[PDB]
Amino acid sequence: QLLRIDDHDFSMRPGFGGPAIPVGVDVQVESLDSISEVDMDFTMTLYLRHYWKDERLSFPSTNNLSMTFDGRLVKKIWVPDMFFVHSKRSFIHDTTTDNVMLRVQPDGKVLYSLRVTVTAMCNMDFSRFPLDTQTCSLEIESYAYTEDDLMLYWKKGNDSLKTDERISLSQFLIQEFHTTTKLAFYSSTGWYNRLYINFTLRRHIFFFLLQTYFPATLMVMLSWVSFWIDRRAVPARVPLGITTVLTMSTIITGVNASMPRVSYIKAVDIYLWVSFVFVFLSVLEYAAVNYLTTVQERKEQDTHAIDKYSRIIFPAAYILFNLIYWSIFS
Amino acid sequence: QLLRIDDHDFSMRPGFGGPAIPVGVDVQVESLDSISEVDMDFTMTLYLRHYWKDERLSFPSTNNLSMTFDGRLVKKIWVPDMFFVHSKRSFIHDTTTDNVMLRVQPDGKVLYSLRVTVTAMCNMDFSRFPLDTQTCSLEIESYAYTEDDLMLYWKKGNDSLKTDERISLSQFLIQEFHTTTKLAFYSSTGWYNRLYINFTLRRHIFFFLLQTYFPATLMVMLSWVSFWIDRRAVPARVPLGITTVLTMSTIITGVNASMPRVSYIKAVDIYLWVSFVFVFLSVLEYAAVNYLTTVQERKEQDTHAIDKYSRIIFPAAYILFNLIYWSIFS
Amino acid sequence: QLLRIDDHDFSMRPGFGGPAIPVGVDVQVESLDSISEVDMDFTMTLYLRHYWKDERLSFPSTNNLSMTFDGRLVKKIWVPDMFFVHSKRSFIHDTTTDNVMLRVQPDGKVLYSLRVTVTAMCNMDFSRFPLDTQTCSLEIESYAYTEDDLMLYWKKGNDSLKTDERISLSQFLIQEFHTTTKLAFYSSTGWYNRLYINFTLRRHIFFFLLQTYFPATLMVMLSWVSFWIDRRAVPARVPLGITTVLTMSTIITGVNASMPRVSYIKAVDIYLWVSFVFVFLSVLEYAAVNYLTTVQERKEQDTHAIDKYSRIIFPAAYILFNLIYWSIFS
Amino acid sequence: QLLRIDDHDFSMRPGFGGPAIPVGVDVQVESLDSISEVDMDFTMTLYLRHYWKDERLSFPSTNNLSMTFDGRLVKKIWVPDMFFVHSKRSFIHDTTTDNVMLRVQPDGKVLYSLRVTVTAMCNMDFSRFPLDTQTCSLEIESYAYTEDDLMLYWKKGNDSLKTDERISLSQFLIQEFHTTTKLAFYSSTGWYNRLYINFTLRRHIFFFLLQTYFPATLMVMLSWVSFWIDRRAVPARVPLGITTVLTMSTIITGVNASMPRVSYIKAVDIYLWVSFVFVFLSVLEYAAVNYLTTVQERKEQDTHAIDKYSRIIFPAAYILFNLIYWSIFS
Amino acid sequence: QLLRIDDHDFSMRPGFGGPAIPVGVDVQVESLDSISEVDMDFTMTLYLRHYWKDERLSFPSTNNLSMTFDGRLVKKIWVPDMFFVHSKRSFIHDTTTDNVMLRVQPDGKVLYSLRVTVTAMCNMDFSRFPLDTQTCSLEIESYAYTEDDLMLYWKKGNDSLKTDERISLSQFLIQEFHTTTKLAFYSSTGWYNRLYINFTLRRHIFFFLLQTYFPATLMVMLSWVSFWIDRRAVPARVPLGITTVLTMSTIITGVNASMPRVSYIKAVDIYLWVSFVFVFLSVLEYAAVNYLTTVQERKEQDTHAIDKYSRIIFPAAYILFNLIYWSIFS
Ligand SMILES: CC(=O)[C@H]1CC[C@H]2[C@@H]3CC=C4C[C@@H](OS(=O)(=O)O)CC[C@]4(C)[C@H]3CC[C@]12C
Ligand SMILES: *[C@@H]1O[C@H](CO)[C@@H](O)[C@H](O)[C@H]1NC(C)=O
Ligand SMILES: *[C@@H]1O[C@H](CO)[C@@H](O)[C@H](O)[C@H]1NC(C)=O
Ligand SMILES: *[C@@H]1O[C@H](CO)[C@@H](O)[C@H](O)[C@H]1NC(C)=O
Ligand SMILES: CCCCCCCC
Ligand SMILES: CCCCCCCC
Ligand SMILES: CCCCCCCC
Ligand SMILES: CCCCCCCC
Ligand SMILES: CCCCCCCC
Ligand SMILES: CCCCCC
Ligand SMILES: CCCCCC
Ligand SMILES: CCCCCC
Ligand SMILES: CCCCCC
Ligand SMILES: [Cl-]
């Protein structure tokens, strides 16, 4: 055997009982699988690499070049114990074998690689849905060793994060990948060092626009045509308002069937509910004209001024509301 | 080797055949995942810590400080056998390795930590839905050892429970974390010690109000516009009541399609069913006016008093019902 | 080592080549998780205990008391091989370790406990849905040993079954737990012994009543008010019947969207389909009156008798049908 | 030990380097779990038994009777390598232990049994849905050994297949179980022998009839009453046709929301789409009558013959179509 | 033993520290399970074969023929480390044992076969849905060895890919299977060689046509009947347009409820929304006639020209739009 595995005890870290051992980390992101709003999490697949030195793995050679081993020797040597903080579930691919790589230099330098899929929690705010921007992060930390025994740092500073050119999402836009570092404290174990991977997401508005705002505006404009019909055609102006109310209710239910039950109001609800009031007030206007006409004719025993005023009042108010709404929320 | 593992038989607990061995427990809660009403359970992620002493793991040193081992030595020494009572499923995270920590002091004190995710049953009452308050608990107990062989207690009394600052739920509010203790009895094995973790949850009423109560009140008020329309316009009052009835039925079905099939009446059912009776009587009110008009005119061969009374009778009754309902349920 | 594990071959049952070995069984039911109607199964969590004697496990002592071992010694001694018949899936809980208990007396008596979750098939008949009663059972049997090698029996007869006081179902009522025994035969292996656990379930009628029967009766009564409207009000009697038909069809679809596709008619189907027929004939009655009026007026060139008869005939028939239905099905 | 495991190498089949070894198979079917139309597969649970002889397992005895071993000795002896062809997923039950049986006769005959659950693909044709008949099969084959090294055959000819008396499907009828044999060829490995298990399935027509054909016929008959109403009552004949069209569209959508997106037309689609044309022609027929009367009145300035003809034309054509459809598709 | 497994160290590849070792690959595709549009992936099952030579496995014989071993010897010898790039999940079937074949020639040639199921990501374009054509591929690569240690190539060039004749999809058509080769580069490990398996898919248009385009055309043609009715029949022309608008909105919602939320407009979206505009303009046409009639009579105090022109204008425009649409997309 080239390596003297049987001559050492690998249940203790290198430099046991002494100074800490530095460990480097490199990360390459392969793809983002899915994003969930009800559960508030996301999925990511990446390659994780570790760098450290162990003098117990030295072997004699002349070329001074890295040598690759099959990978089943990992269960016989010491290996770091990194884990993902605030994760829900994760696994390692094992087809057709474990996706593990192990390269050892003659002096004792070791390279270790893995391929994992991780689901992690991300807190999102929907106060501007569906015109919002979200920020998420992925955290890496050692589980058993504190900063007094294991120091964790990025191998090459910012240049330690690589991304695939095929990363794409059908619903979002991904930008601004960067890495940071911070310390963590646990009340009963000690201090630990954390690594972060940050990115930003932006939503696409075209689908939501064409699927929600256009039908609502169409129904609102359809509600207006009743003002141009003679009041003597009783079975001609009530069905318009009734069907517009029904369609607005159906649209509201369909839109609300998707997002989770938050405790605050979203941007889309403001537009939909105001448009419901405009349609609702249309029915009341006709009832007022009908009642006034009956009272006026009773005392005695053309177009009324109410319709002529409404034909100009309603569109101006709707346009002003739309301008304000699209100026506030951009 | 620093530890003499092979020199002892670890199939027996320390102090075998003698007095019980005290074991301490510490718990830190990381996050609350989800809550289900159809299945009546919840998911939690936490860190579990154990404290005990074993003289067979003593090693000589001078600094008198804890030493950390990799973690694969756990399956070669004795370890407690705690489990979660009334759980549906659970697992231990194993990425990139088993989330296990092991620190041993020179005298023989041992620290053992784990990271687990548990789903546990919680019995909930929906008599005041959606203005109810729910209380749940998580139970920890030893499986194989009775009170005469293993004594279980909290390490620091009330101060043994810590919570993360990011624990939150989009639909519930979390409060009042505390711990208790109690004994349990099994008819064929003996007495055991149990530990409890208690918390309280409160719902948010904004979404339910805006999504259910407002449309029902709007429909009820819409049904009142038929009283101010002349009775000679037959195709002007029946469709209003018809569409209000259809909308109320659709709303009731949509609300009831989510909650489980309980055997008692909830608070939301009272409001929806009573308002359904008000809309139903609107159609019957029109029938009485129409029938009496025909009878009077036939014997013979302005506004009727029935509508004049109804216009004041209905809103007062509805307001009184709303006041009583919101006084009972606050 | 207190036990001489290495001095024997544990690949053979105790008393190999001789008389059969008795085995006892104790069961305690913890909870019932869920019940599925489309899949026709149920889920149960329980504790399973075995009692047998093996002289190869005897050890010297003086107190004559049971001694508890950790549980990893099970994989080196002989253990029975019970399994659940007609089960779809099952597993053993493994948090934080395998839920296994092992106690050995000095003479050789052994106790073995497990915690398992089992999903088993149950045949259900929905001819009286939703006023039906269902009976299900759970079966236990030895897989490899026949009655000539292993005898299976209840440890204490009837008193071998215990239930928790927290067992409950939101939609059913649990009662009448009891145990039986029966022999089984396989055409190519021999005779085996079986154990049974029986229980009964009863539904709750409040939800189904309030969700299905009341709206149908309300719609049927709504269809009756058209008889009190003058036939000259053409847009007053057709929309009522049309909307009642649409509502009845929607209710039928909603009810059928849950139960599986059985080959027989259910009790709830009879009540709904009869109601739809009554509403269907109401529309035809209006056409009969209208057609006769045109024919009568043509020859020539008040309330019709048909309506007067129907106003009394229809409610009596509906009440008679309801009385007969509620007397037959209790 | 009774068996000399350590004295032989079990990495080679019996008769290695020589003639092939015969292996017999017996199968008992326990239950059929479910059938999927969108995924086109089914689930089955069965017992699989193997028969062969190995002289290395001979042990001395005088009674000449089969002896049963616990089952953990399987991983130390040679065992066949059968697998299910065209399967999607499968597993072996392991509660409370692996469902494995092993009986060895004194001369060397071996019996080996397993309990497995298999999901397999079946190609189905829906040209006659829902009056179709489906035929599926399950295939068993050796993976690594060719016909020159392992000969596979049924142990007892036709009598090698047994079925439980509790096998039933809520929607299908099961009949005609039988077994066949055939050879298979792979372009780069050689020839293999296959075993088949065949059965037949038939559907139940009651649910589909009651849920689809009855409402469609009711709507078609309802659309016919418009020919018996006076044409001067304009708000009396249009809602009937419009609501029948809406109901037919809803029924078609509900029926189509289940079956997968096939590339051809199904039998149920023929009946529903033809009835849609009959209702559609009713609206156009009404429009033609109204236009002709207006033209006739303008030139000048009782029931029209078109309705009188239609009252006889429509029912006869519908009855003829029903007779043809129910004769073609039985 | 025939093979000297224990006499060598199999943690190093053949020719360790020297030239690369060629490896051949053969693939036979069994079936394609499903295709997902929301997740944009596909599932495939196949047999994977490897060819290489190792002198350490030589054994003496005279027949010079391949010898088959059971399959558990794989975990004691060196074996390649292939994996699937851009995959989501995968597994190896293990019923009733691991589906592994191992044949070794006397000189040292080794054959290794596996049966796996893989899910891979495919980027799809829905610009021409549902008249589009999709191209997907599957990638194979080595994980730990670079091109300087392991050379990967197809065993027989193009003739290394075989397909089963039972491969079929209910919604797609499969054609054009071929293989390619390309190099890959990672910034921190080196160069690797990849293999590709390409195929093409085409959709079936009959279902989408019959289910979406026919109802829309029927509704559009139905909306045209309002032009042949006299304008004095006021309650005859509005409900037709209103109900057609409602049906069109329902159809649009049903179509859009399935496809993912893309940022571009699909081919089916163009056809449906243009049809909605035609029906929408019909209501405005009726309003224009009604208003102008009142104005003319007031000044004063037969068929309108607008309807006469529209009866010819609308069908011509619809036919022209259909011709252009079906010419653009073929
Ligand atoms: C005076 C009349 O005779 C007209 C005037 C307004 C009309 C209603 C307007 C909207 C709808 C909703 C629709 O729901 S649906 O989802 O099933 O399409 C069913 C039809 C219905 C109830 C109409 C029925 C006919 C009217 C009462
Ligand atoms: C918390 O623990 C302390 C000390 O054990 C006790 O005095 C106090 O009552 C406890 N509080 C609660 C709410 O149980
Ligand atoms: C059953 O098997 C027997 C003997 O192999 C054969 O004669 C008979 O035709 C078979 N029956 C069927 C239905 O295949
Ligand atoms: C198949 O392979 C041959 C030889 O390598 C090559 O000439 C041919 O172009 C290939 N065909 C395709 C479709 O790649
Ligand atoms: C940035 C796109 C805004 C689109 C607004 C559309 C308002 C009708
Ligand atoms: C529409 C009724 C509103 C009642 C608000 C009550 C807030 C507690
Ligand atoms: C709506 C009818 C209720 C009948 C209740 C009968 C209780 C046995
Ligand atoms: C709905 C018409 C059914 C006619 C009887 C069919 C019997 C196969
Ligand atoms: C009803 C429209 C049919 C169009 C057929 C087009 C076939 C390519
Ligand atoms: C809890 C009973 C409330 C009744 C309100 C009408
Ligand atoms: C037992 C027959 C029930 C039928 C009720 C109408
Ligand atoms: C199979 C086509 C039948 C058509 C009957 C009119
Ligand atoms: C891409 C534009 C298509 C227009 C069809 C009329
Ligand atoms: Cl009308």
Side-chain angles (χ1 to χ4, degrees), chain D residues 157-158 178-180:
Chain D
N158 309 69
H178 64 274
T179 62
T180 52

Side-chain angles (χ1 to χ4, degrees), chain E residues 209 213-214 217 326 330:
Chain E
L209 284 178
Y213 293 87
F214 192 60
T217 307
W326 291 114
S330 300

Side-chain angles (χ1 to χ4, degrees), chain C residues 10-11 16 81-83 86-88 90 143-146 188-189 192 242 256 261-263 273 276, chain D residues 30 49 67-68 70 72 93 95-96 99 103 113-115 164 170-171 204 207 210-211 214 218 240 243:
Chain C
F10 287 88
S11 62
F16 182 82
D81 202 335
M82 313 304 173
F83 82 104
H86 296 105
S87 61
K88 294 185 177 180
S90 51
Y143 189 84
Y145 297 93
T146 62
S188 58
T189 55
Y192 300 90
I242 293 302
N256 269 328
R261 305 180 288 268
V262 294
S263 65
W273 280 108
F276 189 85
Chain D
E30 177 168 325
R49 304 182 179 90
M67 311 307 299
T68 302
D70 55 339
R72 72 164 173 258
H93 304 261
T95 299
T96 66
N99 301 12
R103 300 177 181 178
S113 179
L114 289 177
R115 180 169 176 255
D164 200 333
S170 62
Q171 197 183 354
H204 289 331
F207 178 85
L210 179 60
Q211 185 64 60
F214 198 68
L218 289 183
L240 280 302
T243 54

Side-chain angles (χ1 to χ4, degrees), chain E residues 138-158:
Chain E
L138 182 61
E139 309 171 6
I140 305 177
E141 189 188 327
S142 180
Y143 192 85
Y145 299 92
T146 61
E147 67 176 2
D148 300 333
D149 297 328
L150 189 148
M151 299 190 304
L152 195 60
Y153 65 100
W154 291 101
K155 184 63 178 180
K156 294 180 297 298
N158 310 59

Side-chain angles (χ1 to χ4, degrees), chain A residues 1-2 26 28 30-34 37 45 47-49 51 63 67-73 91 93-103 111 113-115 117 156 162 164 166 168 170-171 204 206-208 210-211 214-215 218-219 221-222 225 228-230 232-233 235-236 239-240 243 247 251 258 302-303 311, chain E residues 9-12 16-17 38 40 48 75-78 80-92 112 114 116 118 121 123 139 143-146 149 186-190 192 194 196 234-235 238 242 245-246 249 252 256 259-266 269 273 276 280 283-284 286-287 290-291 294 297-298:
Chain A
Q1 298 180 354
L2 187 59
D26 273 1
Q28 178 172 346
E30 176 170 329
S31 62
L32 280 72
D33 291 336
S34 62
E37 295 81 5
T45 305
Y47 301 89
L48 191 62
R49 304 184 183 93
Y51 299 87
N63 49 15
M67 308 305 298
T68 302
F69 296 92
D70 57 339
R72 72 163 173 258
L73 201 58
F91 66 96
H93 303 256
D94 52 355
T95 296
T96 63
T97 299
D98 291 358
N99 296 14
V100 179
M101 184 180 63
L102 182 63
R103 301 177 181 177
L111 173 58
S113 179
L114 291 175
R115 182 170 178 257
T117 300
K156 289 172 291 299
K162 295 292 184 177
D164 199 325
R166 306 177 188 90
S168 178
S170 60
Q171 196 175 343
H204 284 337
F206 174 79
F207 179 89
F208 288 92
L210 190 59
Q211 294 300 320
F214 195 63
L218 286 182
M219 294 299 104
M221 291 181 295
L222 177 63
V225 312
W228 299 77
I229 300 183
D230 187 13
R232 297 183 299 179
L240 272 302
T243 53
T247 306
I251 291 177
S258 300
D302 52 356
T303 301
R311 290 176 186 176
Chain E
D9 183 12
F10 288 89
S11 61
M12 301 178 297
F16 186 80
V38 288
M40 302 171 58
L48 188 63
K75 295 184 176 180
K76 304 177 181 180
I77 61 178
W78 185 85
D81 194 4
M82 311 305 171
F83 82 104
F84 298 93
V85 195
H86 293 102
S87 59
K88 290 186 173 182
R89 71 190 75 93
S90 47
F91 64 96
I92 305 181
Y112 178 63
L114 290 173
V116 300
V118 190
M121 305 181 300
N123 179 267
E139 309 171 6
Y143 192 85
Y145 299 92
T146 61
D149 297 328
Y186 294 87
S187 62
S188 57
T189 56
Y192 301 89
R194 290 184 179 177
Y196 292 83
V234 185
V238 181
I242 297 301
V245 166
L246 264 298
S249 180
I252 291 180
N256 253 326
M259 293 301 298
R261 302 183 276 267
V262 294
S263 63
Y264 38 83
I265 181 174
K266 299 181 294 299
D269 272 327
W273 280 105
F276 190 87
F280 178 79
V283 179
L284 298 182
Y286 179 81
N290 194 275
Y291 180 81
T294 302
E297 291 190 354
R298 187 192 301 103

Side-chain angles (χ1 to χ4, degrees), chain D residues 1-114:
Chain D
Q1 299 180 355
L2 191 59
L3 294 178
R4 299 168 52 183
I5 305 300
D6 296 328
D7 298 5
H8 307 275
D9 186 11
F10 290 90
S11 60
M12 298 172 296
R13 65 172 183 86
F16 182 81
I21 186 167
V23 177
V25 176
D26 274 356
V27 165
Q28 176 173 339
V29 180
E30 177 168 325
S31 62
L32 269 64
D33 296 331
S34 59
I35 301 178
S36 179
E37 292 81 0
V38 288
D39 302 329
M40 298 171 57
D41 65 9
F42 60 93
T43 316
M44 181 186 298
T45 304
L46 62 80
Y47 299 92
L48 188 62
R49 304 182 179 90
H50 306 80
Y51 303 87
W52 79 94
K53 184 180 181 180
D54 196 335
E55 286 73 15
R56 297 174 296 183
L57 302 181
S58 179
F59 66 99
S61 62
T62 62
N63 50 15
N64 183 31
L65 296 178
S66 302
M67 311 307 299
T68 302
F69 293 89
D70 55 339
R72 72 164 173 258
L73 213 62
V74 176
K75 303 179 181 179
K76 307 173 185 178
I77 62 177
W78 185 83
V79 163
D81 195 5
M82 312 306 172
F83 84 105
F84 298 94
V85 195
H86 293 97
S87 60
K88 292 185 175 180
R89 75 192 77 95
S90 51
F91 64 95
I92 303 182
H93 304 261
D94 52 355
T95 299
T96 66
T97 299
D98 296 2
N99 301 12
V100 178
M101 186 181 67
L102 184 63
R103 300 177 181 178
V104 179
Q105 289 188 357
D107 58 328
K109 294 182 178 58
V110 186
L111 171 57
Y112 179 64
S113 179
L114 289 177

Side-chain angles (χ1 to χ4, degrees), chain C residues 110-144:
Chain C
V110 186
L111 174 56
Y112 180 64
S113 180
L114 291 175
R115 182 166 177 258
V116 297
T117 300
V118 182
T119 298
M121 307 185 305
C122 181
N123 184 269
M124 302 180 297
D125 189 8
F126 302 103
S127 60
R128 298 175 60 91
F129 177 86
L131 291 80
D132 57 332
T133 300
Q134 311 289 352
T135 59
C136 300
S137 61
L138 184 60
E139 303 161 354
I140 307 176
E141 186 183 331
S142 180
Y143 189 84

